[PDB]
Amino acid sequence: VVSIGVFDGVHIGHQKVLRTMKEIAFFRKDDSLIYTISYPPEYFLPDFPGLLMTVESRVEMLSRYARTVVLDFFRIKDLTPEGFVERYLSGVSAVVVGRDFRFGKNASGNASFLRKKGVEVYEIEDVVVQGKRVSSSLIRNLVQEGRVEEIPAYLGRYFEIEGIVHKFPTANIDRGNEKLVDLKRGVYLVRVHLPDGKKKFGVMNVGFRRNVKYEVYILDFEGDLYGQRLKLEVLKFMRDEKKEELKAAIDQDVKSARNMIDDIINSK
Amino acid sequence: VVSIGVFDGVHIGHQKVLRTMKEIAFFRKDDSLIYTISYPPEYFLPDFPGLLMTVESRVEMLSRYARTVVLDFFRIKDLTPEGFVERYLSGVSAVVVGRDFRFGKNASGNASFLRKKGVEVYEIEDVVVQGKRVSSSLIRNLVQEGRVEEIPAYLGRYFEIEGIVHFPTANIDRGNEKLVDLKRGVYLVRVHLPDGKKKFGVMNVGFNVKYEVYILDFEGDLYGQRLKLEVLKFMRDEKKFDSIEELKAAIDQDVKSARNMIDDIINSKF
Numbered sequence: 001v002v003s004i005g006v007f008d009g010v011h012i013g014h015q016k017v018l019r020t021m022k023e024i025a026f027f028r029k030d031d032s033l034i035y036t037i038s039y040p041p042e043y044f045l046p047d048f049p050g051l052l053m054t055v056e057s058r059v060e061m062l063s064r065y066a067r068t069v070v071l072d073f074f075r076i077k078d079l080t081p082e083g084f085v086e087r088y089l090s091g092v093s094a095v096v097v098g099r100d101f102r103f104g105k106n107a108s109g110n111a112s113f114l115r116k117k118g119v120e121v122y123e124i125e126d127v128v129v130q131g132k133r134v135s136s137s138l139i140r141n142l143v144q145e146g147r148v149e150e151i152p153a154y155l156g157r158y159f160e161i162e163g164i165v166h167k168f169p170t171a172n173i174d175r176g177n178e179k180l181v182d183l184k185r186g187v188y189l190v191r192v193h194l195p196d197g198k199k200k201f202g203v204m205n206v207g208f209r210r211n212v213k214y215e216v217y218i219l220d221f222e223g224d225l226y227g228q229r230l231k232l233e234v235l236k237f238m239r240d241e242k243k244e245e246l247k248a249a250i251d252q253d254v255k256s257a258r259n260m261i262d263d264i265i266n267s268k
Numbered sequence: 269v270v271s272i273g274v275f276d277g278v279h280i281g282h283q284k285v286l287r288t289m290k291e292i293a294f295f296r297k298d299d300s301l302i303y304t305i306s307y308p309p310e311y312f313l314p315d316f317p318g319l320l321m322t323v324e325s326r327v328e329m330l331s332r333y334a335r336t337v338v339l340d341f342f343r344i345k346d347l348t349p350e351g352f353v354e355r356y357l358s359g360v361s362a363v364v365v366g367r368d369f370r371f372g373k374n375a376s377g378n379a380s381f382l383r384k385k386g387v388e389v390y391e392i393e394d395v396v397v398q399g400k401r402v403s404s405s406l407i408r409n410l411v412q413e414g415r416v417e418e419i420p421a422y423l424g425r426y427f428e429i430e431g432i433v434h435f436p437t438a439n440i441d442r443g444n445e446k447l448v449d450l451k452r453g454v455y456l457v458r459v460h461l462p463d464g465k466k467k468f469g470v471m472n473v474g475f476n477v478k479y480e481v482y483i484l485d486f487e488g489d490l491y492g493q494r495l496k497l498e499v500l501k502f503m504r505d506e507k508k509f510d511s512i513e514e515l516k517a518a519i520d521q522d523v524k525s526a527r528n529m530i531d532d533i534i535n536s537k538f
């Protein structure tokens with residue numbers, strides 16, 4: 001029994017499907033297999049916002065659920081429905097998908113098809129947080145419009161920026177090379193997970209050059225992060241990206257951060 | 269600094285103007301301000317093709333460049349050049365526009381006037397594309413011939429139909445403004461759904477004019493939500509079908525080419 005799809009971000013509508021995968025599992029005595037497609041057709045277009053995380057990262061969550069097998073978009077973009085079943089669904093007798101799920105050169109095959117190929121399709125009806133069908137798209141935008149405080153209602157958690165370092169002080173994050181989405185330009189209140197389990201707060205600014213840069217000033221930290229990797233949770237969108245008195249502006253933020261922080265701490 | 273004119277479509281011409289503004293201003297630690305004249309004289313004359321987008325849409329885009337302010341046409345329409353200057357340009361150093369920029373009753377207002385009155389007018393050379401001065405007027409003719417493929421070249425992006433929604437086909441209410449109509453026929457389009465998803469779809473214009481799109485791989489009520497539709501390719505002439513089925517056939521023959529062209533649009537990135 002397997003659920004197919006991209007699963008980018010692995011949102012709440014995603015987790016729905018995965019769990020139902022566990023159900024149809026037990027009551028079938030079968031084992032579970034997630035089939036995560038590398039990229040959506042869109043990815044290969046200019047106006048594509050971006051992925052919410054790297055595939056490597058996505059197969060970290062998808063994994064913590066079932067056994068994930070990544071399907072390469074190049075390798076399957078021309079396979080026909082029949083071609084697909086044969087090369088990827090043999091032996092399997094049931095899939096878990098959503099009301100939309102299509103597949104095969106020209107979306108040639110719906111669930112009906114798979115049914116007529118001797119396979120059971122358990123369609124999970126759409127999940128919707130506040131009037132809209134959760135989706136990577138929908139989250140892909142709030143990220144663009146700086147609406148971070150609005151993401152947990154869809155992502156099941158805070159949006160995250162993560163990468164290798166270098167390449168005030170501020171740490172420069174290299175989110176890798178995949179075509180990832182970028183946040184509205186600006187200053188953000190962030191939660192930093194450092195090595196050794198450390199979770200320090202910080203402020204992160206995002207600016208141009210075309211390109212977008214990610215720099216965080218981690219509060220109360222004074223060590224070397226040059227080579228290290230980091231995972232930052234974007235909690236709040238503080239202020240917009242501005243204009244030699246900048247060293248004076250950041251303090252608005254820092255002194256501000258310290259305050260938003262202490263806000264929670266008190267509200268036991 | 270300040271820029272003036274209608275700005276219907278905000279095409280590459282319009283952009284060179286707004287970008288020059290955005291610069292002439294940094295060179296001065298000055299501030300931008302766009303004055304968009306709601307309409308153009310033709311708008312109220314026999315046979316006006318209509319605008320490309322609603323004034324609201326238009327302000328929307330201009331907004332990303334700088335503070336925008338709309339001026340009723342009917343108002344400044346009568347003002348004399350000094351009048352106009354006395355009401356809007358006061359204490360404003362620079363004014364970015366391009367050749368052929370005029371203002372005031374009977375167009376007596378021009379760049380020389382602003383200059384003689386202490387304001388620095390920075391004309392911009394007309395932007396040519398394939399031996400043509402980019403113009404809101406041009407683009408309109410294209411839309412009208414269904415030559416939507418040639419549009420991005422001048423317009424700087426894909427022509428776009430929009431409105432409120434009022435196999436199944438969504439009925440777009442473009443609005444009550446006077447907008448330009450496409451050649452009646454069938455088009456491949458790219459839909460921008462309320463939620464945020466972008467599905468391909470196929471639109472048909474026929475006949476005022478009626479616009480209805482059948483979005484590919486999609487199901488859900490949209491009655492009441494807005495849709496922006498990038499018009500990507502012209503496929504066929506909206507013809508008469510004396511038998512319902514001949515239509516069902518055609519419509520399906522349309523959705524077929526749709527699907528393939530789409531495969532083309534992607535197998536063309538590697």
Ligand SMILES: Cc1cc2nc3c(=O)[nH]c(=O)nc-3n(C[C@H](O)[C@H](O)[C@H](O)COP(=O)(O)O)c2cc1C
Pocket residue numbers: 168170187203204205206207209213215216217240241242243246250253254
């Ligand atoms: C909390 C924080 C807030 C910042 N806010 C801004 C800002 O609003 N505008 C800006 O231009 N730079 C800001 N910066 C700094 C730039 O990111 C900094 O100049 C960096 O070196 C990269 O910018 P650069 O490529 O222009 O040199 C901020 C830095 C920090 C740590």
Ligand SMILES: Cc1cc2nc3c(=O)[nH]c(=O)nc-3n(C[C@H](O)[C@H](O)[C@H](O)COP(=O)(O)O)c2cc1C
Pocket residue numbers: 437454470471472474478480481482505506507508509515518519522523
């Ligand atoms: C892709 C697509 C192509 C269409 N092509 C035509 C066409 O060539 N001729 C036609 O009369 N109707 C066509 N239709 C249907 C009309 O748009 C339909 O009659 C609709 O109800 C509006 O037309 P009406 O106002 O005359 O009823 C097409 C519909 C779709 C979705």
Ligand SMILES: Nc1ncnc2c1ncn2[C@@H]1O[C@H](COP(=O)(O)OP(=O)(O)O)[C@@H](O)[C@H]1O
Pocket residue numbers: 165166168169170171172215216217218219220221222223224225226
């Ligand atoms: N509190 C801190 N926040 C961000 N980086 C720090 C901090 N403390 C030490 N560093 C280190 O210093 C580097 C930033 O160096 P520097 O060149 O001085 O500034 P910039 O951020 O402009 O590149 C980081 O790569 C990191 O290893």
Ligand SMILES: Nc1ncnc2c1ncn2[C@@H]1O[C@H](COP(=O)(O)OP(=O)(O)O)[C@@H](O)[C@H]1O
Pocket residue numbers: 433435436437438439480481482483484485486487488489490491
């Ligand atoms: N894939 C789709 N394409 C077009 N409309 C759809 C689709 N799915 C659902 N709809 C909805 O169906 C309605 C259009 O219904 P229909 O009566 O069949 O078309 P029309 O009256 O324009 O010929 C709209 O409210 C629209 O939001």
Ligand SMILES: Nc1ncnc2c1ncn2[C@@H]1O[C@H](COP(=O)(O)O)[C@@H](O)[C@H]1O
Pocket residue numbers: 004005006007008012013014016017096097098099100101124125126127128133134135136
């Ligand atoms: N919001 C949602 N509600 C229900 N099912 C969903 C939702 N979002 C995704 N799915 C299903 O989960 C799988 C997700 O893959 P993808 O759409 O590529 O992210 C597909 O089989 C979808 O139908």
Ligand SMILES: Nc1ncnc2c1ncn2[C@@H]1O[C@H](COP(=O)(O)O)[C@@H](O)[C@H]1O
Pocket residue numbers: 272273274275276280281282284285364365366367368369392393394395396401402403404
């Ligand atoms: N193709 C072009 N190249 C350079 N400037 C242009 C072009 N088309 C229009 N402009 C300028 O941009 C402004 C556009 O206003 P309007 O002509 O009303 O749309 C006027 O001040 C024109 O001089």
